[PDB]
């Protein structure tokens, strides 16, 4: 149903915006993981300190 692989092979504003959006989604996934990891590390330092 053709004109849509023509549009899917092409792009301009809708897909520039789209790509920006997938990128910012990836970056937010990354920073959320990069705030989950200091949590685990922090619980670890807790377990060490209490053992001291």
């Amino acid at each position: 149903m053709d004109k849509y692989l023509d549009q899917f092979v092409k792009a301009p504003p809708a897909i520039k915006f789209g790509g920006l959006a997938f990128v910012v989604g990836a970056l937010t996934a990354a920073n959320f993981f990069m705030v989950i990891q200091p949590t685990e590390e922090e619980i670890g330092w807790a377990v060490a300190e209490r053992r001291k």
Binding site: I43, W45, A46, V47, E49, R50
Partner: protein, 54 residues
């Protein structure tokens, strides 16, 4: 604040926790002695006196 118990890792009271138990003090103090005991005593006696005078 901290709740009934706190949250779960436990939180943090391994460090508060551990470098407590307790105050310590430590009250490096109030000891008790066995003392020690001396020993007794050197003789056999000798006679001059008192054999003649009794």
């Amino acid at each position: 604040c901290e709740e009934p118990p706190a949250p779960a890792p436990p939180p943090a009271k391994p460090k508060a926790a551990a470098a407590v138990p307790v105050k310590a003090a430590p009250t490096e103090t109030g000891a008790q002695a066995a003392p020690s005991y001396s020993y007794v005593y050197n003789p056999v006696g000798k006679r001059d006196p008192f054999r003649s005078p009794i």
